[PDB]
Design a protein around this ligand. Structure first.
Ligand SMILES: Oc1cccc(O)c1
Ligand SMILES: Oc1cccc(O)c1
Ligand SMILES: Oc1cccc(O)c1
Ligand SMILES: Oc1cccc(O)c1
Ligand SMILES: Oc1cccc(O)c1
Ligand SMILES: Oc1cccc(O)c1
Ligand SMILES: [Cl-]
Ligand SMILES: [Cl-]
Ligand SMILES: [Zn+2]
Ligand SMILES: [Zn+2]
Lengths: 17, 28, 28, 17, 17, 29, 29, 17, 28, 17, 28, 17
């Protein structure tokens, strides 16, 4: 989860539809 | 919750960019 | 290129309008 | 319908979960 | 207020002209 | 800790959305 | 063609940077 | 003005309180 | 130049994200 | 150049240091 | 996570301050 | 030196090309 630690492009991919 | 609120604004902008045409599903 | 640019403003607005509910975003 | 006109905050509520 | 305690959009409406 | 300067930028963006054409008289940091 | 609504959001961000704590009285779209 | 013709930061200083 | 000016604001935000720690060199 | 046409992640890579 | 978040505001400011000159950005 | 304080527009000019 992306406001505790920073998320990479790859972790961010998981929100995409 | 002010910090989490500011971070989320940044997060949805990144998602918009990362996800391109596929779009995305945001939940806090 | 306004389509790409307008989407970034739209997702911020949605973030603000939807609050803890989140939202679901797609172009097209 | 929102890039080519200012949608009402009422209307944008349609995108919410 | 709003940079110490989170303010909803309804709350921010009280600062509009 | 909240950076008030940075929080202020977000608050002005929120105010712009909320108040539209009539604008805002104060930025409530 | 310039979207004035969207341009306005950028202008308010610029104004926030430029005017700092004293703020701005008008958004010159 | 500024959403039809580009305004520099020096120019925007004229709208600060 | 108003449109190119608005686009560049968006562009530097994307670059910031894409480039991560390497940073970037921006020219209009 | 990224304001005439839209640039992908890959075209954007080229501005990075 | 403020470091990531503050960088995004810094690059916008730099974009605005530097104008046609551009700028060079790195973290660290 | 700018995340942990507001740099002057004078100071930020140091990052310009
Ligand atoms: O974890 C995060 C939060 C916000 C933006 C981002 O790129 C990553
Ligand atoms: O219809 C819209 C589009 C983009 C931003 C906004 O606040 C409203
Ligand atoms: O309390 C706040 C602070 C910043 C932006 C916002 O929408 C609300
Ligand atoms: O910095 C800005 C932002 C928007 C319009 C303009 O002329 C200048
Ligand atoms: O060509 C562009 C311009 C601005 C943002 C972006 O992601 C791509
Ligand atoms: O020193 C800074 C940092 C971030 C934004 C800004 O306008 C100034
Ligand atoms: Cl725009
Ligand atoms: Cl922030
Ligand atoms: Zn824009
Ligand atoms: Zn921020």
């Amino acid at each position: 989860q992306c406001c505790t630690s920073i998320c990479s492009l790859y972790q961010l991919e998981n929100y995409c539809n | 919750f002010v910090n989490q609120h500011l971070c989320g604004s940044h997060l949805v902008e990144a998602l918009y960019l990362v996800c391109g045409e596929r779009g995305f599903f945001y939940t806090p």
